[PDB]
Design a protein around this ligand. Sequence first.
Ligand SMILES: Nc1ncnc2c1ncn2[C@@H]1O[C@H](COP(=O)(O)OP(=O)(O)O)[C@@H](O)[C@H]1O
Lengths: 447, 384, 149, 39
Amino acid sequence: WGHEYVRNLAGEIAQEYSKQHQNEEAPFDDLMDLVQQIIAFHMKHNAEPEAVDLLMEVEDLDLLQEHVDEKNYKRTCLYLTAAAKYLASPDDMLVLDIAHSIYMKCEEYPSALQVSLVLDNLQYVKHIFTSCNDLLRKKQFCYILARHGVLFELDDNMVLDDDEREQMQDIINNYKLSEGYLTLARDIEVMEAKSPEDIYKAHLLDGRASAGATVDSARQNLAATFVNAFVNAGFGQDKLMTGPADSSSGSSSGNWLFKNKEHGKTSAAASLGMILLWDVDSGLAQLDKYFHSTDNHVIAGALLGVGIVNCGVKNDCDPALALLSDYVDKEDPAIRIGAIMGLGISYANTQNEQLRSKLTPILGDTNASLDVIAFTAISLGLVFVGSCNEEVAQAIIFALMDRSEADLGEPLARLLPLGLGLLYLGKQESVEATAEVSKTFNEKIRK
Amino acid sequence: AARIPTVTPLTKCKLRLLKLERIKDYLLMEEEFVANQERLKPQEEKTEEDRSKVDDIRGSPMSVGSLEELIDENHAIVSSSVGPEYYVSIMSFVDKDQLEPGCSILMHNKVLSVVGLLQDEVDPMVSVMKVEKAPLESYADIGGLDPQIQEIKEAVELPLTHPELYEDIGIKPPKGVILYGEPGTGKTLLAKAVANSTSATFLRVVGSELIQKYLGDGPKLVRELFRVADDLSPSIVFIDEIDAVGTKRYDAHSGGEREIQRTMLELLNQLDGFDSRGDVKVILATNKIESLDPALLRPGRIDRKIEFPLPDIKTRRRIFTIHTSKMTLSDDVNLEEFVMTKDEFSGADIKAICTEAGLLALRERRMKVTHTDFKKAKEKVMFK
Amino acid sequence: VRIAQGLVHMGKGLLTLNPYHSDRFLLSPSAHAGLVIMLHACLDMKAIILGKYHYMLYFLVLAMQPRMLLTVDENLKPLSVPVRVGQAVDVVGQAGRPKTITGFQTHSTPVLLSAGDRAELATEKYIPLSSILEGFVILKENPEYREEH
Amino acid sequence: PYSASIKKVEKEIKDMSKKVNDLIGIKESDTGLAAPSQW
Ligand SMILES: Nc1ncnc2c1ncn2[C@@H]1O[C@H](COP(=O)(O)OP(=O)(O)O)[C@@H](O)[C@H]1O
């Protein structure tokens, strides 16, 4: 009878279903048979969006799994993915699961992996890996997971070869990311380090500053250090921090480091941690030289740099945890803050229970400075993003009640709610209970 | 009012729904922000207290003044309708967008401060030349020639038909089209179709109407026609009987030839002067172009040249079948018999013959027209 | 201003702060958390960043990733293959097999992908195992390709 | 499919826009008067 008849029937069927759902007294089988026939006709004629819309208005999306062909799955799945962005929580979740089912039936595991990653369900990822028999596809999935920052410990039931398991564990650990970045830098010829002055292009501003005395402000030096760290991040070599001492002077390379004050020294040390990004072997060796400094600020900065270096890269030796756990217990607030932040940055989204156990007691210590507890909350949130672990949320809430009104006025009090929210990032419906609990907080913070 | 002009979707896509939802949310937020002002500090009705206070502040009796200059900072200089120049300032509701010489500014009655503007509904020159209703039927009622119907369409309507075709070619419509032809050639009949089909404003100018009796007047009339047409809207203004520029001499005008010459120079300036006239088209016709000033025709002021010849022996058939559409003529005579009656029967000749035949049939109150009526009309038309 | 200038020249143009991946479909929790922490610290500039906590900017470490599209052979070695790079186009609802990229320029080996730029292989010799060409892509030699001499 | 669903919603929003703008005052077309939110 033509496509227009089918389209008008689909619209009228949607309306009839909408009104019958409010009546709850009409038989469904007669409508279901016509809906199935309409879906088959639409599939045969590449009118996939109309079929998807009809099945959405009927809520019987399960029928899609039977009428999807090898020539029709791409457009259908793209339409489901586009619709999911308009669908809200519960509908979007069911739609994503059905799209994942269509994908597994269609044997395109990469898109299934992406959809499961959106769902944040590790069981579906495990099922996808089990269903895969191609080693190269498994390696690509490991690369994708490493990009997403999710640790997937390959169980022994997944691969029968130990060497391949080690190889994909290294791939997940982003070991080859540094090599790839270095290869790209070599290809573009961007190896040469750029000094902060080159970015500043001071020669272009000298038209009106010829009368300014050379006063090296500490803040200017800190800005220079920050710019130097940003520009030369991941290149392994720097002209200001690690440049050879090739000028007629036997003075330690730390001349610029000692020009900064306290927190400035910490920042200068963290610049070294950035410069050796993703390079664990050389980064640890270079930071070992600064671990011997008598300045507590330099030690804290070195710990934070160690945390930065292992950011996104996991080593089976776990140098970060072993090194930082010894400094976490130290009384000095600066060293404790540096160690905590390094642990949080290096172990972001890892969901390690050992870190939870080591950090929770710090949150309950009333003698700890506000800085320490705020950074502990931030690190706990970073480690447990999207996990909805009730224990960490309860610990942060307990820390929040125990604050006097005076502490609430400091800006640092605004970071504990930030950490608690970070614990709940990306999970919509689970946060209503926590909002209800938070309604009990003091008025100045409650909102 | 002009809240959102984006209608490019023109479908049931989610983008249109999202845009509408965002607009509704913004409107709701604005309404909520506005409502709280009265909820917290209404302080007045805001509906009639403001209007009443404005009426009691501004002079209740507002006079009919005339703005003559511009003073931005709480001031204005005008002349009292009695004559006394005033230094009336600007009021709160001034909305100073009509600050041009001539628009009456209404001042207060107590202190004579500017109270209100003067809505203007006159445009005397434009009104004494504005076409209210369509003159005749569609172009099909012209009949026979259509050598300029396509040409005139391209010259005027085609720019207004879909001005992307001339845009895609990288050019602007032709400057002007001057319709010159034999006396009674139907040039006015061409303007009839132009108006019945026209889409924009049209102005009619009697040819002698450009020459006034007082010296210096004619240039003023030309400048005023230009201002009215241009300042009003996109227009197609036809100054018919352009030969009357210097052909006919009248004793009413104080000036002699140097007055028609001045009027022609002013017309030329107004056609291709020193500014941007805008989107204005000109279509003029004349029956004696041999005397028209050569400068008023150079490509750049009057561009398209159109010549209208007498109806053709083949076109005479369509002309006759047209001008006698609704006549209850008896089959006694055949139009072809009078078709060749006149060696140079122009278009007006056919209409005159038909009208005379109708009148003759009327004198006897008969229902149809006989061959003898046409025979007696033909002699009375051509022979006089 | 100096911090902003340094950020603009991050990695000399090789690293970005994009929290999204795979055509803006996947949100990385770590990068988002770092960026949100940095913004919340910036909310109170004078007290937080200009005070004793200049180091809160190091939460940005989580959000930085490289702009590299490196094609890799089965033997895990880098391979230079021409790649077409251009702005992505939403192909939903378009009849036929519309191209997903606006552009005909071909770039070999590691094209610096900008925000919104999508990549498609310019050669049929290699079948990309990834539907989206980003980061590490393992290329498999096409067994059906015949070199047209 | 929902041809009348979207047209009716758009018309309702368009009518409500005027129904709410008339509650602040822009109407009562004058003969040279400024906006009550202008004086
Ligand atoms: N088909 C026709 N072709 C030409 N003129 C026609 C036609 N039908 C009628 N006419 C006559 O043409 C005249 C139009 O005025 P026009 O000839 O331009 O006058 P003038 O040339 O004196 O300005 C009217 O008398 C009208 O009746």
